[PDB]
Design a protein around this ligand. Sequence first.
Ligand SMILES: *C(=O)[C@H](CNC(=O)NS(=O)(=O)n1nc(-c2cc(O)c(O)cn2)n(C[C@@H](O)CO)c1=O)NC(=O)/C(=N\OC(C)(C)C(=O)[O-])c1csc(N)n1
Length: 501
Amino acid sequence: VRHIAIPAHRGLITDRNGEPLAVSTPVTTLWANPKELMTAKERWPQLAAALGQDTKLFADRIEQNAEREFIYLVRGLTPEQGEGVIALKVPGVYSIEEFRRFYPAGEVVAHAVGFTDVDDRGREGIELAFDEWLAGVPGKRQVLKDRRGRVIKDVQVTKNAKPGKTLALSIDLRLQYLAHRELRNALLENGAKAGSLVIMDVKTGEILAMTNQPTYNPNNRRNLQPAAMRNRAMIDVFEPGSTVKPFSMSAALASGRWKPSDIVDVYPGTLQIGRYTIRDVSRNSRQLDLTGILIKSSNVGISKIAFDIGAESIYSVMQQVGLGQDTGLGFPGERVGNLPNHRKWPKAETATLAYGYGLSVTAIQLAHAYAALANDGKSVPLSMTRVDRVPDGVQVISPEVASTVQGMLQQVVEAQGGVFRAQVPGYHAAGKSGTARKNAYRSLFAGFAPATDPRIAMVVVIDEPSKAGYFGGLVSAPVFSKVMAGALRLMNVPPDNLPTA
Ligand SMILES: *C(=O)[C@H](CNC(=O)NS(=O)(=O)n1nc(-c2cc(O)c(O)cn2)n(C[C@@H](O)CO)c1=O)NC(=O)/C(=N\OC(C)(C)C(=O)[O-])c1csc(N)n1
């Protein structure tokens, strides 16, 4: 070896407003030339001590490497700690200036941002996804050494290091902190195993927050529990159950065959389909209108609509809003779930599609589909980076149908017998609860606000709540209420439901 590499300064990662999320910090690595150390053995114990190493094990290491001209002693010290050991003047001890990431927000955005390894290479999250952008390129310095490997000098910088480039995420750290706190709070209030919360800008496709529990502090490389390192919002797939009923309803309203005031008879709350029985969560209904089917969350009601309009129409809307489909994000480990298709849809599969059973999605997909509904039926491609020019997007549901469904979902939140815990102080909001039997349950709420001129969509997933209440409208709805109330205020959306008159 006639060169040493010159590490490049890795690009700053910020939130959408320039708040630092991953910052390259100076550290110093110490290395030694055993051939030189072998001439200076009386110094070894002082050096061993400086390095926190056992005297005899350190001596054993040097002796075993006596034929080598390079070994690492320790990596990633503070500059001051490194200078401290260099100041001992032990022959054959040298230092290299390197970088280590610091993550100022720690566990709050750990799953989005990810982490680098000891060599400063991205290995999880955004650090990995945008590694090429962030990394820049190392330089090279030619060195002169004697025949024992003693470093005499730097001869010159052959190649200069090129710094990596700054990256501004879509995340709004203010919203990320709020979501993080409120998801953690709800997890603890419910004794739950895990959860995720996603907030999206419905107009721009930006992911404004994406938080999961459990989480981890990426600044601390000890312990490390891989289960806490899971970006569940992107990696965990789940059956969305009742939260997809608004897409079934969109298909119904688009077919020409259904209007909101139409009635379906769901008595006696079960419906036999050959060997399979559809069963409603509550079984105290006969006639329901279409908004009532959503309020009551009736699997029987949505199934009967599905039989009438056919599964193909429902599958198309779900596919178009992105359920079970690749997001087109860069993101390491992201899963796609599954939206089943059929050459010919049998009756059972038509019903189960319509109420979200036996298909699987991620929280990011579900939030993206709600964002399309909220954005007057126009889907904008997802982004984990700040969006300055908004892409054109794709009109997936007709604006009229989107408008009608928005209004129904506002009634789901606001009407008698609805999901009152999702109501957002100061604002009209809209959305739909779900509960999936995995007994072990996952509690869901998906929605957007304000209900007119929607601005943000949100999905809350609470995995295995362990108190007697486990329904999405009980467990996840209040998290939507609190997080939406804070997020809208932070975004300076004027309240559209303050008390009047
Ligand atoms: C939809 O997800 C569907 C039916 N379950 C729900 O709609 N849960 S919820 O919509 O979040 N929800 N339902 C109720 C509720 C319950 C009642 O007994 C009565 O009478 C009225 N409402 N609440 C309470 C709110 O009204 C308070 O405001 C809700 O929040 N899910 C399923 O069909 C699935 N499993 O169902 C359960 C009942 C969990 C089960 O079978 O054990 C399901 C769908 S996909 C899947 N794997 N499971």
